[PDB]
Nucleic acid binder design. Structure first.
Lengths: 55, 267, 100, 88, 51
RNA sequence: UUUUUUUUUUUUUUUUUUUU
RNA sequence: GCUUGAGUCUCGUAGAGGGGGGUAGAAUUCCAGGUGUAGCGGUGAAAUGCGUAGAGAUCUGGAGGAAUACCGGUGGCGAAGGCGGCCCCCUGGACGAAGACUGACGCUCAGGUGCGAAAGCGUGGGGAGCAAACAGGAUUAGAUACCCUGGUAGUCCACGCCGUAAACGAUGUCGACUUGGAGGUUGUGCCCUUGAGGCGUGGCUUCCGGAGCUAACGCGUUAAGUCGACCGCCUGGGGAG
RNA sequence: GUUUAUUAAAAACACAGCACUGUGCAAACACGAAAGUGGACGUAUACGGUGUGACGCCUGCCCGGUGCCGGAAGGUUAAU
């Protein structure tokens, strides 16, 4: 979650509205949470996380 | 003229604020390679170009074409031209030759001045545009493919390359963005040398215009023996056109050789 | 030495020219003493948006221990390549030695 | 921001006996040398207000430090300006 | 935002795009936008809804 | 946070004294 | 002689960065040719244009104009103003730290030094989309008008005299203040790290706790209750900016 | 100032900037019957229209008529 490899396993944390879910479902720890926030960013712009259905 | 080095005018202790206070670009002698222009209007006989005043024409800088591209060179000094406002340099070609090239704002060190087909890209003698990259600045541009450059000054006149335009047929300038002159014509770079000599008035009058020509000053006004007006009495006050030929909008062309102007947005 | 992360996208089908082009782009990096964590053939992937009329590129991804001294001579030699669809760069927060 | 070929000599020639490496005379000699070091690359970057402050800063403290050594230790102060000047 | 219907009686299986990208994208723009004043209003709205 | 179904309708003189 | 006010080095660190460089992408104009028969806009009710010289549209092919959409926040920076894409260089402020070395080199300020929202002067222009002015048809008790197509300036600004208003603890300099606990937050010491943070601790922010003090809304220790160095401003109606 | 020597002696106005205008260029002008010589050894910030009225601001405003021309949805009706 610091880096790309586990965020390809964590594609379930995405809503039917196509985006990265609010954590209330499970309440993530603010450290473990903040790490994934940067790995999402780099993956979003390369497209290794293909943002929503069409793309 | 926000620019530098600017030379701003004087504090009013003489009749003159302008002229241009540019120290460091007049020089003497007229070096070995020089020529002149001659007589007065003299067209054979009854000259149509009005007012004349034709004494001191006088001399001009001699180097046209400048087609030596590949042979590298360096900058000796830079001057001025009273016929164009032009910032020209004296250029020593490392082969054995001295020449006069048209320059941008301060091009010295004596830099690395060279051209050649895809071999080079720097501000360079004359240089073909289908072998170098795309910008605002280009400069020399053969007015058609082998004839001679369009612009003999670095007065400000940006001609602006377009990339791949209808297969090499390029540029984007002022009064006709459908020149379609092919990029097989020669560049050099680039269009701001001395804007300071032109962007501001040198005087009201100045040496630039009264030592060897008279400019125009009338046509319409006084003595009814030349123009389509009129009686007397100080009056004027009619319809008086520039006849038989026109003034304020109409156009003049219909047919020519090459003729490349197409869309024409005008205004 | 900025541990840059850089993608680019050639025409999808020039598969004989991309390997002679991969030698030719590491060339810049190696001629500068820069080192390569990874250099991934991504492949012929299809597109998010309508760019260049073949509906696909052929991508590459790489991770370089290299200085600012080359990043424009790459941005240059991409942008003058008449067959390169798109390219971008990201920097630091370590390298990535493991593939995508 | 200068070379260790410079810091390591500043140290020796403005220190006393041992561990003077951060005292008032070795501090003046390091500021003085660093100010003068910066003069030899400042002509570049051309819009550089973002760095010219922390330089202005160090060369205003250079003046202050000196006028402070005067009030504290006159016969250090004098000896130090006999070698380097900086009196401005 | 690309939805398949199938054996087409007109199925209305297109319903679920109301979730955001069809619709909730208009909380700024209507002919015109709001323009002035909505930006703390965005968090003004939370102190209305605590029950 | 879209809030124009018309715009306007002269002055007075009302006032049951006061200290608490 | 000290409490170390104050600094420099040293070691570490993250975002919408003071000023030059680069540039990832919807719509939708108008045209080059592909087509379909006549009606698109727009409204309280529709208009002046337009339509057997075919009302848009919508593909295909071209030419121009260079918004920052959003991991975007149920928020982050910042002296304010004030950007939001990420980034090359110059690298504001930081400011969390083992230490190292000198001893108040210290606070806080007038006229001044700079910065300086709205605006004039601009000098040459960069000249999308909207909409004061600009242009009209309309609804007319006069519309000197809102629409509604057209519409600039404002978008920003190289450079630069910029005073300046609404930037209200209706309010600066701050040191002790140690009944305190309650959140929003955030760098962080210690745990079999079995954990949804338990034992803790400084900061950036708010919740609202006595004795006092005390009109009525109550304010309740850093806060107006004691206590202090001024660089002020405070001369009552109308004189006034 | 010395410029209309010839009524005035300037109480004439030659400055000079510019929005606009004629040339994408065998450029505008053609004087000579054949010149391409002014402009040119040069490009629409070169040279010319018509002027400008120090400098610096300021050009509000308003399209009836009448000009300047441009165009084509469309009729007056031609060499074709």
């Amino acid at each position: 979650e610091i880096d790309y490899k586990d965020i390809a396993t964590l594609k379930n944390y995405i809503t039917e509205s196509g985006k990265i879910v609010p954590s209330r479902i499970t309440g993530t720890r603010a450290k473990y949470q903040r790490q994934l926030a940067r790995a999402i960013k780099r993956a979003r712009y390369l497209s290794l996380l293909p943002y929503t259905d069409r793309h | 003229v926000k620019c530098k080095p600017t030379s701003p005018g004087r504090r009013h202790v003489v009749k003159v604020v302008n002229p241009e206070l540019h120290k460091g670009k007049p020089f003497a002698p007229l070096l070995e390679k020089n020529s002149k222009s001659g007589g007065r209007n003299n067209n054979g006989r009854i000259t149509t170009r009005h007012i004349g005043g034709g004494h001191k024409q006088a001399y001009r800088i001699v180097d046209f074409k400048r087609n030596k591209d590949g042979i590298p060179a360096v900058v000796e000094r830079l001057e001025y031209d009273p016929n164009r406002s032009a910032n020209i340099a004296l250029v020593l070609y490392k082969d054995g030759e001295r020449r006069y090239i048209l320059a941008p704002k301060g091009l010295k060190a004596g830099d690395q001045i060279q051209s050649g087909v895809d071999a080079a890209i720097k501000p360079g003698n004359t240089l073909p545009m289908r072998n170098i990259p795309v910008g605002s600045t280009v400069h020399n541009v053969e007015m058609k493919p082998g004839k001679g450059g369009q612009l003999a000054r670095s007065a400000g006149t940006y001609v602006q390359i377009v990339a791949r335009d209808g297969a090499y047929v390029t540029l984007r300038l002022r009064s006709g963005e459908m020149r379609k002159v092919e990029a097989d014509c020669r560049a050099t770079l680039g269009e701001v040398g001395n804007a300071e000599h032109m962007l501001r008035v040198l005087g009201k009058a100045g040496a630039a215009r009264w030592r060897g020509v008279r400019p125009t000053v009338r046509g319409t006004a006084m003595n009814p023996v030349d123009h389509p007006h009129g009686g007397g009495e100080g009056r004027n006050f009619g319809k008086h056109p520039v006849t038989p030929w026109g003034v304020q909008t109409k156009g003049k062309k219909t047919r020519s050789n090459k003729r490349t102007d197409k869309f024409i947005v005008r205004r | 030495m900025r541990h840059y992360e850089i993608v680019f996208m050639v025409h999808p089908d020039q598969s004989e020219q991309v390997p002679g082009m991969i030698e030719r782009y590491t060339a810049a990096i190696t001629g500068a003493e820069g080192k390569i964590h990874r250099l991934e053939d991504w492949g012929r992937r299809q597109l998010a948006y309508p760019i260049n009329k073949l509906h696909k590129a052929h991508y590459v991804l790489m991770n370089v221990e290299a200085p600012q001294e080359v990043i424009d001579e790459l941005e240059t030699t991409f942008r003058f390549n008449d067959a390169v669809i798109r390219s971008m760069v990201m920097r630091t927060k370590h390298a990535v030695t493991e593939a995508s | 921001s200068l070379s260790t070929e410079a810091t390591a000599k500043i140290v020796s020639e403005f220190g006393r006996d041992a561990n003077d490496t951060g005292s008032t005379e070795v501090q003046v000699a390091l500021l003085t040398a660093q100010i003068n070091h910066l003069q030899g690359h400042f002509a570049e970057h051309k819009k550089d207000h973002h760095s010219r402050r922390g330089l202005l800063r160090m060369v205003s403290q250079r003046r202050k430090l000196l006028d402070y050594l005067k009030r504290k230790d006159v016969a250090r102060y004098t000896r130090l300006i006999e070698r380097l000047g900086l009196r401005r | 935002i690309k939805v398949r219907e199938n054996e087409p009686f007109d199925v209305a299986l297109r319903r679920f795009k109301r979730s955001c990208e069809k619709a909730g994208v208009l909380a700024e723009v209507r002919r015109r936008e709001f323009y002035e004043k909505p930006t703390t209003e965005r968090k003004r709205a939370k102190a209305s809804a605590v029950k």
